Amino acid sequence: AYTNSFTRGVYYPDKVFRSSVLHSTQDLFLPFFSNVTWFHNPVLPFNDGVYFASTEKSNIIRGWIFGTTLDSKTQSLLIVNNATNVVIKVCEFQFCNDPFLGVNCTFEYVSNLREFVFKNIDGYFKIYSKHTPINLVRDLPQGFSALEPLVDLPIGINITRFQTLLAYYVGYLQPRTFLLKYNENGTITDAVDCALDPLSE
Amino acid sequence: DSTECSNLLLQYGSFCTQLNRALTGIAVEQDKNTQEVFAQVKQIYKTPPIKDFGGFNFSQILPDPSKPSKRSFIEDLLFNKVTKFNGLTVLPPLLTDEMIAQYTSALLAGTITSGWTFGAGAALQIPFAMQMAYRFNGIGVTQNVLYENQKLIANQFNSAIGKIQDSLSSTASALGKLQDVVNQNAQALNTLVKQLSSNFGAISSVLNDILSRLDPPEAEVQIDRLITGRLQSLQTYVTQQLIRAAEIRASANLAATKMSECVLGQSKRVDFCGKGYHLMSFPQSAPHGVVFLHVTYVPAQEKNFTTAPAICHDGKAHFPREGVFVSNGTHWFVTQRNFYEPQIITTDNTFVSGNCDVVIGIVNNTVYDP
Amino acid sequence: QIDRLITGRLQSLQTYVTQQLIRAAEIRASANLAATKMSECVLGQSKRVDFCGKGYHLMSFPQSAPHGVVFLHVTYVPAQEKNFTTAPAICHDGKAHFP
Amino acid sequence: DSTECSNLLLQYGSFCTQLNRALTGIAVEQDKNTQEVFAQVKQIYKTPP
Amino acid sequence: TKCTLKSFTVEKGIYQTSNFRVQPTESIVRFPNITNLCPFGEVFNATRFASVYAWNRKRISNCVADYSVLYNSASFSTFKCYGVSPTKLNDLCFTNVYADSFVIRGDEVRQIAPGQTGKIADYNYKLPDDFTGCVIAWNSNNLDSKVGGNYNYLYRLFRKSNLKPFERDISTEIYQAGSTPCNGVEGFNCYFPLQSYGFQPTNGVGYQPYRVVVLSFELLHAPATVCGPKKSTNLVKNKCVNFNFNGLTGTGVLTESNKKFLPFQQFGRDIADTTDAVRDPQTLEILDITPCSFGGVSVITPGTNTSNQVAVLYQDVNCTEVNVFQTRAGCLIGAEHVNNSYECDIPIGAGICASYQTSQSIIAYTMSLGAENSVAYSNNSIAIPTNFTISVTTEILPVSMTKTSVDCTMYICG
Ligand SMILES: *[C@@H]1O[C@H](CO)[C@@H](O[C@@H]2O[C@H](CO)[C@@H](O)[C@H](O)[C@H]2NC(C)=O)[C@H](O)[C@H]1NC(C)=O
Ligand SMILES: *[C@@H]1O[C@H](CO)[C@@H](O[C@@H]2O[C@H](CO)[C@@H](O)[C@H](O)[C@H]2NC(C)=O)[C@H](O)[C@H]1NC(C)=O
Ligand SMILES: *[C@@H]1O[C@H](CO)[C@@H](O)[C@H](O)[C@H]1NC(C)=O
Ligand SMILES: *[C@@H]1O[C@H](CO)[C@@H](O)[C@H](O)[C@H]1NC(C)=O
Ligand SMILES: *[C@@H]1O[C@H](CO)[C@@H](O)[C@H](O)[C@H]1NC(C)=O
Ligand SMILES: *[C@@H]1O[C@H](CO)[C@@H](O)[C@H](O)[C@H]1NC(C)=O
Ligand SMILES: *[C@@H]1O[C@H](CO)[C@@H](O)[C@H](O)[C@H]1NC(C)=O
Ligand SMILES: *[C@@H]1O[C@H](CO)[C@@H](O)[C@H](O)[C@H]1NC(C)=O
Ligand SMILES: *[C@@H]1O[C@H](CO)[C@@H](O)[C@H](O)[C@H]1NC(C)=O
Ligand SMILES: *[C@@H]1O[C@H](CO)[C@@H](O)[C@H](O)[C@H]1NC(C)=O
Ligand SMILES: *[C@@H]1O[C@H](CO)[C@@H](O)[C@H](O)[C@H]1NC(C)=O
Ligand SMILES: *[C@@H]1O[C@H](CO)[C@@H](O)[C@H](O)[C@H]1NC(C)=O
Ligand SMILES: *[C@@H]1O[C@H](CO)[C@@H](O)[C@H](O)[C@H]1NC(C)=O
Ligand SMILES: *[C@@H]1O[C@H](CO)[C@@H](O)[C@H](O)[C@H]1NC(C)=O
């Protein structure tokens, strides 16, 4: 299955405040109105960044695995929110053939629609996210919202493939130029994909 | 704020100095432009408390004595329609807006109360109706026209001023020219400032990062790349400013000529002072510019007449002294060219020359002898 | 080393040439103005106001000068004046007489 | 048609886009020149046969 | 002015000769709160240490390493760093640091060093010849000795070959000293490869236990997570400073700001990519960075022919930050403010002009636009001239320049 990524996947590219400003920036964004794979635990590629999204009523999706082999051969990020506690590990874990939860470690940390952006640049694993209420079943909602950064991991583990841990969506970022509009309060209120159509160009 | 960068910069000689010198020349030139456009009157004339200008109503162009800077209503409309710490400063103009307003008020009051005489010499008062009679004789329309249509002319003028107010209040793009100028300058500066964030081939756009990270022997090469880039940015900016200032100087010379010939006199150059026959002009200030309100005479309702080049009375050929022979089908008259005012043909309308066997188109008529 | 020198001196020459082009544009505009003044002021009698001096133009005389021209504008200036009463027209037999 | 050269060129910032801007300004100005010189008549008059 | 014009005489006018710029009074450095300190304590202060043959390694990552706690301590008799100064380590970040800890006897401390041989270096713990890092050692007689002799610490006595740098061998294989295989059975030419130190408190200092920690530093193709303290200072507002916030440095005046930064935003930015406000890393407040007052210094002078007295106009500054006159063009010093209006002689700006007038001094005044006048306008009164004058004016126009021609090759490559 596939679905329309109307105008979602836009995230604050940095930690710089700007007010009432139209700023043009080129980064790995989810191209507007592109195809996002829609799923109801397959292994997926991580070419150059992954926009991930989930709609929930019972907290089914729990976590993620990122890595290269994910079979206790090379380090691999494991990000699991176990029922109250967020745990991030980068141990050379040995994973199951189908790693489901019952219905050498170099780092370790412990702490409706949800959007996440997982990208890996120069050994840093940027995780952006945004939570919102929603009343919709069969598809992503249409509208605009910007994603705050939440985690910047110094992990250094290079990632090629990944998998989810339990309806969700996967889209793939591309190196595109965007025009971002910042209102008086420093927040992104609109965006224009600079390679979508001639009017946007 | 970088000693090492300044030491490197001193090797390029006087590029910096001549850039500064060019910009200073531009600034002085701008002050000269404004001075030569507006300061064309040696004295500051002021209108009397009486507004007895023959029915013409100038209240929307004369200064408002209870107002921001003693500007007229239209000047205020014009002013409401037109809208750092990196080594860039903006020097203030030598003539403040209040002084420009005083100059245009002087020009306007001199024009109203004296005509063109204040430009030629001492301002000699003259009733405004008589001044308009002069301005009508200046376009080939006898003055009795004005004196017999004075109320209509005054009402048309007042309505035209009202329409000008409406046009300026409704359409902002009316002042596009001025606005464009401002935009251009701003954009240039923005571009210049943004050029500080480029690398030009260095490892970083931040001079301090290069200095703090690299050893001097290589930080020097990186800073040389940055210096060449930024010096080229400055040179491009200054050259664009020079060319654009030439543009503005040409327009300022044109505006000075228009004020001299159109406001301080009555021009006869076609379409120099608007479409129509020029009667007068009124200057108004505007941000970094001037606005001329050209009052012109435009013939409106026209008629078909039969015409002749001369008439044959006793074998003599009679030509019109000033006018043209016309016929309404039965009788012949001699009217002025620019306005149908037919008059009986008499030997003081026409002058004799030759006989009827040479002119091609001579007609027959009787020339009354008073 | 010579490449650095050549780039510097070539840049200086380009700057000089560009400034000269703009300055020559200035001078060409002024030369056109002077030619127009000679045509309309010396070879005729201009009626353009303030084009040929303050006052009503009578004539002009051109004088050479180093890299330029100097016009002596002879103009007419009204000097002494009087207040008079004035009228736009006068009734004689009911009819209006205008000057 | 060189990606590496283009990536090097965009290190200079707006050294190129402003050249394009200046040239387009010149072109618009040329059209304005021609219109000012010739389009001084509102209607197209015609001589009689 | 005389130098800036390269002349000993200066014509009447207003010249810009230099730039006024406030200097920074002091320096401020601000870094985030120093937390997540590296756990050196669990290495240096561990109650039990490893045997040298089984030396422990602790990985130090993602933390602030306050090396001073180590190099200012009086608790160490050996503190020897090769290729690095621990003081400069405070300014450096590494992907990993490694603390290798063990116990040897005093006479063997010298063997923990590059290019050394002996029992310990050959068979137990080996440093590389190009070792970069530190060796720290202190006597542990009070902790590792016992009256009856502490034998819990072991060393490897036999091995088939020398250790490679940082190699760790914990095998208890029976050492085959002869040609007969041992098959795990001890006997003639078949020896256990380990032997206990005998640590008694009355031993000579050369035979007393010493605890040793070796610090190694590692940079990988991964984020550098072990960084030095990088202490900060107090911040002062409303006065020009040179500042260094988390990653940015500059000069300006820091003032309480008006902006509402998002919880994750650190630096403000103007439209033209200029830093505008900063978030203080320790106090969650936003500080506007207004760059320190600066501007041109113009010299207003009559011709040196007439006088050598000058007035100085500081452009776009207050009269506190430099017979003083505050004009819209800046602060003017040495020019006497007069109420009377005159014709403009030396233009200053915003309608102010300065001139040298009578006993004589330089004065600044709002320039006059000309004598005011009224025309006695009435609806039935006209003024007619009765005489005239013939006036000859003089208009000077440049026509041409000098025809300079420049030889490019001769100018450039003489
Ligand atoms: C000249 O025209 C102005 C209007 O342009 C007249 O001012 C108006 O006067 C009426 C009556 O007092 C007011 O209701 C309007 O609001 C005024 N309009 C403006 C724009 O001021 C003025 O009265 C006219 N001059 C004379 C002498 O009548
Ligand atoms: C052409 O004009 C003449 C003069 O205006 C007209 O003759 C006059 O006609 C009026 C009547 O409207 C008489 O009262 C005058 O006495 C006439 N004047 C003379 C001198 O005869 C003439 O009728 C006009 N022709 C046309 C076709 O309208
Ligand atoms: C997504 O791809 C499918 C074909 O794979 C196409 O039919 C659809 O139009 C695409 N989505 C959009 C928004 O164009
Ligand atoms: C910005 O936030 C304030 C509250 O802090 C709010 O009052 C204001 O309306 C917001 N601005 C916009 C444009 O929403
Ligand atoms: C004048 O007459 C011509 C015919 O000769 C006609 O075409 C034209 O419309 C007339 N003008 C007016 C104003 O009626
Ligand atoms: C005007 O044209 C007509 C038509 O040919 C001709 O008969 C007449 O002689 C001409 N008259 C003049 C004065 O041109
Ligand atoms: C005018 O009248 C004369 C006689 O007086 C006659 O010879 C001539 O033909 C007439 N011309 C016209 C154009 O009617
Ligand atoms: C005309 O009368 C006015 C009185 O208002 C006076 O000011 C003016 O000087 C007089 N003109 C001459 C030339 O005397
Ligand atoms: C940082 O530590 C200081 C004590 O040194 C404390 O006063 C301050 O509240 C801390 N800041 C934060 C953001 O916790
Ligand atoms: C180790 O413990 C001692 C107790 O005397 C203490 O002074 C020292 O600071 C501690 N060092 C570390 C690194 O924990
Ligand atoms: C200026 O000073 C010189 C002496 O250097 C003198 O010869 C000249 O007359 C002076 N001129 C004026 C106008 O003061
Ligand atoms: C500088 O002077 C202006 C008035 O010209 C005043 O408003 C301002 O407060 C002064 N500066 C300071 C720091 O007070
Ligand atoms: C100028 O006049 C003002 C009053 O308008 C007065 O306060 C001030 O002291 C006067 N200055 C001088 C220098 O006379
Ligand atoms: C006109 O002015 C001249 C001086 O230029 C004087 O000699 C002459 O007498 C004046 N004439 C009259 C009539 O005032």
Author numbering:
A (entry chain C): 27 to 66, 81 to 143, 165 to 172, 188 to 242, 264 to 298
B (entry chain C): 745 to 827, 854 to 1140
C (entry chain B): 992 to 1090
D (entry chain A): 745 to 793
E (entry chain B): 299 to 620, 641 to 676, 689 to 744
Q: What do the authors say?
A:
The heavily glycosylated trimeric surface spike protein mediates viral entry into the host cell. Spike exists initially in a pre-fusion state where the domains of S1 cloak the upper portion of the spike with the relatively small (~22 kDa) S1 receptor binding domain (RBD) nestled at the tip.
To test if CR3022 binding destabilizes the prefusion state of spike, the ectodomain construct described previously (Wrapp et al., 2020) was used to produce glycosylated protein in HEK cells (STAR Methods). Cryo-EM screening showed that the protein was in the trimeric prefusion conformation. Detailed analysis of the prefusion conformation led to a structure at a nominal resolution of 3.4 Å (FSC = 0.143), based on a broad distribution of orientations, that revealed the same predominant RBD pattern (one up and two down) previously seen (Wrapp et al., 2020) with no evidence of CR3022 binding.
